C-alpha cells in the first residue's frame, strides 16, 4: 500500500511506503485519534523475532543482507538468546541502532542531523561513580566550548528489570525549583519534585533562581547517588536583548546543552534504560517554553511591563509582543557568545528538506505534527502546511516511568 | 474504553465517555496516525434516522414516550414509502445546532446553542437562493454586531438535483494571474474567479473585488449574482501606532461564512447550508494576510518597519506578524465589527470543553486546528490534550461542484 501526504503551500505530494514496516501501536483507532495525547522483563519468545528484524535491517543497511556474516550473526544471537536469555550488540550495531532511534524519532524536528551522532559506549560501566565519569566526558565532548556536537552515552541494558541503570534527572543539566511556604516558586517550577528528592538525598541547595541540579545516578538497580557536575563543564549564557538594555537586568540565563536523560532506547528488543543524549537548542524551547509557559519561568508579565505595552486587554497582543522580544533575546545571546543554536525558521525549513530526502531515499519519515510545529509563529513556518504521517519504527526512543515511582529502595 | 485527557498546564484531568457514541471513521489506525491530514438506500437511512430521533427525544427528556415511538413509526413509514423523509422544524434546528456542537475543528463552539437557523427548504431557484442568502448576510452582519446563522436549502434526493453554493465562502475576494506572473488579489480564488468570468462575470480586476455568488438550484446550471455592496461590510486596516500601515491599502470583510460544506442530519444530506459567525483575528492577520500562498504581505510590512531582513534569526517575520495581527484587531474594534482575539477565543473554548465534559461526557476536538496559527503555547489550548472523533449530526467536506456538475 501507498499513502500520500500533501504540502498545502507548495502542492508537493509525497508517497509513503515505509509505514508498512511499522510494528508498535499509535494509540489511535478507526474511531478515535489520540494524536494530541502526550503519553499514549522480555521472554526469549518475544526476543528472537525482534533481534532478527533488527539484524535484517542492520545487514541491509551495510549491503550484506543474506551474506555469510549476516547468517552467522543470526545463528550466534539465536544461540546467545537460548543460553543466556538475552544478547549483546556488536559496537557497530549499537552505533547504527542509536542513530536509527534518532532518525525514527517522530517528535524531533532536528533529525536532518541524525547520521552525525557521537556514540559513547558505556556498557562496561558498573557503578554510579562510573556513570558520573561517563556523563562528565559526554558533557565536555558535546559542549566543545560552545561549538556543540550531538552525542549519546549508552549504559548497560536491562537484564531482569531488577538491575536497571537509570539517570534520575530528566535532563543532565536543569535548574532547581523550590516551592516556598507562600506558594510561589523560586527557580524552575518543572523541577520542584525532583529538586525535593535531591535535597532529601543530601544535596545542599543554594536556593537561587538558577541552581544547576546535581546528577542522581543509579547503577545496576542500586540506590541512586548524588554528584555535582563540575561547574567549569556547565556552559551557560546570560540573556540580553540587542536593543533593550534593561533586558539583562531581568537576571536571566540558560544552559547551552539540551540533554534528555530519562528516555529508554530500544534496539533489537534490548532495553537501554540509561542513554542520555544531547544536541543543541532551537531558540523557542527556551524563549517560548522554558521562559513563557505559565507553569515554568512565566516571564511574560514582567517583560511586557518593562516594554510599556498596553496590558489591560489581551487584544493589544501584549503577550505576543513580549514573546517575540524574548525569543530575539535568546537567539542574540547564544549567537553573541558563539554557542550553537538554531532559530525556528531555519530548523523547520531544514526539517522539510530532511523529510523530502527521506521520502525519496527511505520511503517515508514518520513525523508528529503536534510536536514538530514550533510553539510560536506556527503558520509562518513551512511545517504547519506539511501533512505528516505519524507511526512507530524501531530502533526507537521511548518514555519510561519516573524511577522514584518504581524503584525498590535498598538502604 | 473510558478515556482520560489531561491539561499539562493546570493538571486538570477529564474523562471522556462521549467517544463511544462515535459513528464515522477517523482515517487513523493502530499503525498510523493521520491527525494532520486535511481531508482524511432505504436500508441505510432508517438506522441513521433512528439514531438521530433517539438523541433528539433524549435531549427534550421524552425518550421512550409515545410521541417518541409515534415519530419513529411515522418516519419509518415515510422512508419505506417515499425513500426519504422530512425533518420537523424542531428537528432541523436541533440538528444544525448539533452539527456545530460536533465540529471538532471549531474553536468557537461555546456559542453553539445561539445559532439562528433559517429554513430555506421551500426554495426552488437560484434567484430564490440569492434572496435567502442576502437575507442571511444582512441578519448575520447586523450593522457589525454579528449574529451566528445558518441557511438550509433543500436536501439531496437522487443526487442529480443538488442545491449548491459554488463559492467556498459567501464573501471572498477575486484572484487573477497576471502577464507579470505574479497574482493580483487572493491567489486562493484564481480558479473560482476563472469560473465566474467564464460564466460571464464583469471582473473589475482589482485587489479586493468581492466575488459574485454562483448559485446552483435543483441540479441546474449555476447563475451569477452580485451581493448588494451595502450588505458586504468591509473594514479598512490600520495600525494604532504605525501611521504608514493604511498605505498598504489593506481591507477585509466582517462576515466569515462557509458555504461549501454538507450538513448531515439523521442520514439526510443538506448540500447547500451556508453558515456564519464572526472572525478570530488570526484567521485574517495570520492566515489571510501572511500565508506565502495568500496575500503574503510579510515582506512589505517588515520593510516599512525597517527591520533586519538579512537573517531569519532577527525574527523579523515574527515581529511583523504580531503587528499585522494587532492592526486587524484594532481596526475591527474601532469600526465596531465583532472580532475575537486568539487569547480570548481559546480561553472560552477551554471553558466550553469543561462544560461539555461535565454535561455531555466529552467534546470532540482536533488539536491541529484548534491551536491558533501564531503564539500556540501561550494559549491554553496548546497544553490541553484533546480526543478527536466524529459524531453526527455533522458538517462534512464535499467535492467542489465544478468537477461533479454536468452542464
Ligand atoms: C541536533 C540538534 C537537535 C535539535 C535542534 C532538536 C530539536 C528538538 C526539539 C525542539 C524537540 C522537541 C522538544 C520539546 O518540545 O520538548 C526534540 C525532541 C526530541 N528529539 Fe531532538 N533535536 C536535536 C537533536 C536530537 C538528538 C541528538 C537526539 C537523540 C540522539 C534527539 C532525539 C529526540 C527525541 C527522542 C525527542 C522527543 C522527546 C520527547 O518526546 O520528550 N534529538 N528535538
Ligand atoms: C461564532 C464565532 C465562531 C468562531 C470565532 C469560530 C472559529 C473557528 C475557526 C478559527 C475555525 C478554523 C477555520 C480555519 O482555520 O479555516 C473554525 C472552523 C469551523 N467552524 Fe467555526 N467559529 C465560529 C462559528 C461557527 C459556526 C456558526 C459554525 C456552524 C454553524 C461553525 C462551524 C465550523 C466548522 C464546520 C469548521 C471547520 C471548517 C473546515 O473544516 O474548513 N463555526 N471555526
Ligand atoms: C537532544 C535534544 C535537543 C533539543 N534541541 N531539544 C531537546 C528536548 C529538551 C530540551 N528542550 C525540551 C527538552 O525535552 C524535554 C522532554 N520533552 C518534553 C516532555 C516529554 C514527555 C512528558 C512531558 C514533557 O514535558 C533534546
Ligand atoms: C463560520 C466561521 C467562523 C469563523 N470565524 N471562521 C470560519 C472559517 C472561515 C474563515 N477563515 C477560513 C474559513 O474557512 C475556510 C475553510 N477552512 C479551511 C480549509 C478546509 C478544507 C480545504 C481547504 C481549506 O483551506 C468559519
Ligand atoms: C497536549 C499537547 O499534546 C502537549 O501540550 C504538547 C503539544 N505540542 C508539543 N510540542 C513540543 N515540541 N513539545 C511539547 O511539550 C508539546 N506539548
Ligand atoms: C497540513 C496541516 O494539517 C494543515 O496545514 C492545517 C494545520 N492546522 C490548521 N488549523 C486551522 N485552524 N486551519 C487550517 O487551515 C489548518 N491547516
Ligand atoms: Zn490519530
For residue B227, the domain's CATH number is 3.90.440.10
Measured distance CA(B407)–CA(B11) in Å, rounded: 57
Residue B185 in any domain: the answer is yes
Q: Which residues pair with A396 in a beta bridge?
A: A266
Residue B48 in any domain: the answer is yes
Q: Is A210 exposed, middle or buried (0-12, 13-18, 19+ CB in 10 A)?
A: middle
Å from A253 to nearest chain B CA? 19
The answer to whether B175 and B188 are in contact (CB under 8 A) is yes
Residues A325 and A354 in one domain: no
- Is B290 touching A (CB cutoff 8 A)? yes
What does each C-alpha distance from A267 to A54, A106, A119, A148, B53 come to in angstroms? 7, 16, 14, 26, 53
Q: Which of B108, B109, B112 to mutate to test the pocket of ligand 2 (most atoms within 8 A of CB)?
A: B108
Q: Could you say which of A330, A346, A362 is where a domain stops?
A: A346
Task: Print burial letters for A247-268: b (CB count within 10 Å at least 16), e (below 16).
Answer: beebebebbbbbbbbbbbbbbb
Residue B6 in any domain: the answer is no
Residues B139 and B224 in one domain: yes
Residue of A18, A29, A291, A315 to mutate, interface with B, max B Cβ within 10 Å: A315
The answer to whether B153 and B270 are in contact (CB under 8 A) is yes
Residues B23 and B129 in one domain: no
Task: From chain B, pick out residues whose CB is under 8 angstroms from the CB of A389.
Answer: 32-34
Domain that holds residue A213: 124-149+164-235+399-403
Residue B407 in any domain: the answer is no
Q: Which residue among B287, B377, B385 places its CB closest to the CB of A36?
A: B385
Taking the alpha carbons of B321, B322, B324, B329 in that order, is the dihedral positive or negative? positive
Task: Print burial letters for B97-106: b (CB count within 10 Å at least 16), e (below 16).
Answer: bbbbbbbbeb
Between β-strands B116-119 and B149-152, what pairing exists: parallel, antiparallel or unpaired? parallel
Q: For B228-279, what is the HEC assignment?
A: CHHHCCEEECCCCCCHHHHHHCCEEECCCEECCCEEEECCEEECCCCEECCE
Q: Which residue among B292, B314, B387 places its CB closest to the CB of A34?
A: B387
Q: Is A186 exposed, middle or buried (0-12, 13-18, 19+ CB in 10 A)?
A: middle
Residues A98 and A172 in one domain: no
Taking the alpha carbons of A76, A77, A83, A84 in that order, is the dihedral positive or negative? positive
Tell me the backbone φ, ψ of residue A365, rounded to 5 degrees.
Answer: -155, 100
Residues B340 and B350 in one domain: no
Which residues, at least 6 apart from A75, have a Cβ–Cβ distance to it below 8 Å?
none
B83: alpha, beta or left, given left = phi > 0 and alpha = psi -120 to 50? Answer: left
Going by the DSSP 8-state scheme, the letter that residue B156 receives in this structure is P
Beta carbons of B325 and A345 less than 8 Å apart: no
Q: Could you say which of A311, A329, A346 is where a domain stops?
A: A346
Residue B4 in any domain: the answer is no
Q: Which of B293, B369, B376, B397 to mutate to test the pocket of ligand 6 (most atoms within 8 A of CB)?
A: B369
Helix/strand/coil for A254: strand
Tell me the backbone φ, ψ of residue A390, rounded to 5 degrees.
Answer: -110, 125
Helix/strand/coil for B173: strand
Q: Name the E strands within B24-177.
A: 116-119, 149-152, 164-165, 175-177
Q: Which H or E element spans position A54?
A: helix A44-61
Residues A320 and A366 in one domain: no
Q: Taking Cα atoms as reference points, which of A55, A96, A97 lies closest to residue A77? A: A55
Residue A70 in any domain: the answer is yes
Residues B91 and B114 in one domain: yes
Residue B7 in any domain: the answer is no
CATH, residue B266? 3.90.340.10
Give residue A142 CA to ligand 1 midpoint distance, Å: 15
Give residue B38 CA to ligand 6 midpoint distance, Å: 7
Å from A255 to nearest chain B CA? 19
The answer to whether B388 and B297 are in contact (CB under 8 A) is no
Measured distance CA(A74)–CA(A78) in Å, rounded: 6
Residues A247 and A341 in one domain: yes
CB A371 less than 6 A from any atom of ligand 6: no
Cis peptide before B180 (omega within 30 of 0): no
Beta carbons of A375 and B382 less than 8 Å apart: yes
Task: From chain B, pick out residues whose CB is under 8 angstroms from the CB of A380.
Answer: 286, 290, 298, 317-318, 321, 374
Measured distance CA(A342)–CA(A331) in Å, rounded: 8
Cell of B338: 465583532
Q: How was this structure determined?
A: X-ray
Residues B238 and B286 in one domain: yes
Helix/strand/coil for A289: helix
Cell of A87: 544478547
Residue A5 in any domain: the answer is no
Residues A250 and A339 in one domain: yes
Q: For B38-79, what is the HEC assignment?
A: CCCCHHHHHHHHHHHHHHHHHHCCCCCCHHHHHHHHHHHHHH
- Is B140 touching A (CB cutoff 8 A)? no
Which residues, at least 6 apart from A194, have a Cβ–Cβ distance to it below 8 Å?
A168, A169, A170, A177, A213
Taking the alpha carbons of A188, A216, A90, A42 in that order, is the dihedral positive or negative? negative
Give residue B376 CA to ligand 1 midpoint distance, Å: 19
Q: Name the E strands within A22-101.
A: none
Going by the DSSP 8-state scheme, the letter that residue B394 receives in this structure is E
Catalytic residue among B201, B278, B316, B356: B278
Measured distance CA(A259)–CA(B180) in Å, rounded: 51
Task: From chain A, pick out residues whose CB is under 8 angstroms from the CB of B376.
Answer: 373-376, 378
Q: Which residue among B6, B32, B382 places its CB closest to the CB of A389?
A: B32
Q: Name the E strands within B281-372.
A: 339-340
**Residue with grid cell 539540551, as numbered in its chain:** A258
Domains contained in chain B, number: 3
Which residues, at least 6 apart from A83, have a Cβ–Cβ distance to it below 8 Å?
none
For this structure, is B283 an active site residue? yes
Which residues have CB under 6 Å of ligand 1? A 102, 105, 107-110, 113, 117, 150, 152, 260, 263, 277, 279-280, 282, 285, 342, 347, 371, 397
CATH, residue A290? 3.90.1230.10
Residues B116 and B141 in one domain: no
Cell of B147: 449574529
Task: From chain A, pick out residues whose CB is under 8 angstroms from the CB of B343.
Answer: 314-315, 319
Residues A71 and A131 in one domain: no
Euclidean distance between the first and final Cα of chain B, in Å? 50
Cis peptide before B393 (omega within 30 of 0): yes
For this structure, is A108 an active site residue? yes
Between β-strands A215-218 and A166-167, what pairing exists: parallel, antiparallel or unpaired? antiparallel
Going by the DSSP 8-state scheme, the letter that residue B295 receives in this structure is T
Amino acid at each position: 500500500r501507498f499513502l500520500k501526504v500533501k504540502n498545502w503551500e507548495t502542492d508537493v505530494v509525497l508517497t509513503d511506503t515505509l509505514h508498512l514496516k511499522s510494528t508498535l501501536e499509535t494509540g489511535c483507532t478507526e474511531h478515535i485519534c489520540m494524536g494530541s495525547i502526550m503519553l499514549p522483563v522480555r521472554t526469549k519468545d518475544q526476543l528472537f523475532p525482534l533481534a532478527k528484524e533488527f539484524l535484517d535491517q542492520y545487514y541491509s543497511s551495510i549491503k550484506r543482507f543474506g551474506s555469510k556474516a549476516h547468517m552467522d550473526r543470526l545463528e550466534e544471537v539465536n544461540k546467545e538468546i537460548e543460553s543466556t536469555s538475552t544478547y549483546q550488540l556488536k559496537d557497530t550495531e549499537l552505533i547504527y541502532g542509536a542513530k536509527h532511534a534518532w532518525r525514527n524519532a517522530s517528535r524531533c524536528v532536528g533529525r536532518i542531523q541524525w547520521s552525525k551522532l557521537q556514540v559513547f559506549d558505556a556498557r562496561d560501566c558498573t557503578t554510579a561513580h562510573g556513570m558520573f565519569n561517563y556523563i562528565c566526558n559526554h558533557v565536555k565532548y558535546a559542549t566543545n566550548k560552545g561549538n556543540l556536537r550531538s552525542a549519546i552515552t549508552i549504559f548497560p541494558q536491562r537484564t531482569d528489570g531488577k538491575h536497571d541503570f537509570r539517570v534520575w534527572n530528566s535532563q543532565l543539566i536543569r535548574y532547581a525549583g523550590y516551592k516556598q511556604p507562600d506558594g510561589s516558586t523560586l527557580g524552575d517550577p518543572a523541577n520542584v519534585q525532583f529538586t525535593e528528592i535531591c535535597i532529601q538525598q543530601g544535596w545542599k541547595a543554594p536556593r537561587g533562581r538558577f541552581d544547576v541540579l546535581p546528577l542522581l545516578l543509579q547503577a545496576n538497580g542500586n540506590d541512586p547517588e548524588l554528584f555535582q557536575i563540575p561547574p567549569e563543564l556547565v556552559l551557560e549564557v546570560p540573556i540580553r536583548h540587542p536593543k533593550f538594555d534593561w533586558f539583562k537586568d531581568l537576571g536571566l540565563k540558560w544552559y547551552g546543552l539540551p540533554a534528555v536523560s530519562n528516555m529508554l532506547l530500544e534496539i533489537g528488543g534490548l532495553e537501554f534504560s540509561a542513554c542520555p543524549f544531547s544536541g543543541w537548542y532551537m531558540g523557542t524551547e527556551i524563549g517560548v517554553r522554558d521562559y513563557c509557559d505559565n507553569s515554568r519561568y512565566n516571564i511574560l508579565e514582567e517583560v511586557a511591563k518593562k516594554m510599556d505595552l498596553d496590558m489591560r486587554k489581551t487584544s493589544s497582543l501584549w503577550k505576543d509582543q513580549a514573546l517575540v522580544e524574548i525569543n530575539i533575546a535568546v537567539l542574540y545571546s547564544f549567537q553573541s557568545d558563539k554557542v550553537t543554536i538554531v532559530d525556528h525558521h531555519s530548523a523547520t525549513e531544514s526539517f522539510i528538506k530532511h523529510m523530502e530526502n527521506e521520502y525519496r531515499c527511505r520511503g517515508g519519515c514518520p513525523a508528529d505534527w503536534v510536536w514538530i510545529v514550533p510553539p510560536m509563529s506556527g503558520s509562518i513556518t513551512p511545517v504547519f502546511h506539511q501533512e505528516m504521517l505519524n507511526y512507530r519504527l524501531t530502533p526507537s526512543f521511548e518514555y519510561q516511568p519516573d524511577p522514584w515511582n518504581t524503584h525498590v529502595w535498598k538502604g
